[PDB]
Amino acid sequence: ERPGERRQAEMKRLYGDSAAKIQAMEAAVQLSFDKHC
Amino acid sequence: AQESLESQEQRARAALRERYLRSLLAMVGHQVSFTLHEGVRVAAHFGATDLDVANFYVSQLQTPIGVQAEALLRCSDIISYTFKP
Amino acid sequence: SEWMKKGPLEWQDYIYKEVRVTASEKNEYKGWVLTTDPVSANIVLVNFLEDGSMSVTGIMGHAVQTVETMNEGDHRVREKLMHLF
């Protein structure tokens, strides 16, 4: 089970070539939050 | 061979999302004011938002009744929010 | 509706325009479009205040009723929003 594959496909549908850039951004914003959320 | 319309849409989504995500990061370490239902105006210290749904995790939420040390303001509860970078 | 069914290139064309937004509970906003979150359709406006500072307001996409373009906005707007964060 690879529970994130559906999400990855949707991120590719939405963002195309930029999908990994946007994923990295969302990760980094999370970190900035999770630091002191 | 030209960039498709879909590829252009995807770049615009990514540009829009990047600008939005920067605006959320800009709220870290700031107060945020909210316009809620029934015309209620509150404000708090920003903590986080969810990145799927625009829920806000805040601290020292000031309401017309008192202060709540921690609060989750659900996206369905909010009409607008305002802050000063 | 209407705002929430726009596509990303349509949302993107509002960036740097001055708009009037009407929202739930007869809330009204005028400001310069910074971005639209493509996930939520949340609209993010920037206001240039009289004291020279800037505020940023997010309107929940589900609360938006109408968005009317008021002015097109010049290169100084672009520079201001560029140095916002």
For residue A8, the surrounding DSSP H or E stretch is helix A5-15
List Cα–Cα distances, C17 to C20, C22, C32, in angstroms.
10, 16, 5
Chain B residues with CB-CB distance to C8 below 8 A: 9-10, 12-13, 16
Number of Cα atoms under 13 Å in the Cβ half of residue C48: 13
| C53: closest CA of chain B, how far (Å) | 8
Chain B's closest residue to C26, CA to CA, is B39
Best A7, A14, A25 residue to mutate vs chain B (most B CBs within 10 Å): A25
Yes or no, beta carbons of A21 and B6 under 8 Å apart? no
Number of Cα atoms under 13 Å in the Cβ half of residue C74: 1
Q: What is the 3-state secondary structure (H, E, C) of C19-69?
A: EEEEEHHHEEEEEEEEEECCCCCCEEEEEECCCCCEEEEEECHHHEEEEEE
Chain B residues at the C interface, defined by Cβ less than 8 Å, are 8-10, 12-13, 15-17, 19-20, 22-23, 25-26, 35, 37-39, 51-54, 75-76, 78-85
The CA distance from C43 to A37, in Å, is 23
Instruction: Give the residue among B12, B82, B7, B20 at the shortest CA–CA distance from B46.
Output: B82
The CA distance from B21 to A32, in Å, is 11
Q: A27 Cβ partners below 8 Å, 6+ apart? A: none
Best A18, A34, A35 residue to mutate vs chain B (most B CBs within 10 Å): A18
Instruction: Please state how this structure was obtained.
Output: X-ray
In this complex, which of B23, B81, B84 lies closest to C35 when CB atoms are compared?
B23
Expressed in percent and rounded to 5, the helix, strand and coil fractions of chain A are 85, 0, 15
Q: Determine whether B17 is exposed, middle or buried from the number of CB atoms within 10 Å of its CB (0-12, 13-18, 19+).
A: buried
The CA distance from C40 to B66, in Å, is 30
Q: Determine whether B18 is exposed, middle or buried from the number of CB atoms within 10 Å of its CB (0-12, 13-18, 19+).
A: middle
In this complex, which of B21, B51, B57 lies closest to A37 when CB atoms are compared?
B57
The CA distance from C20 to B76, in Å, is 22
The CA distance from C62 to B80, in Å, is 10
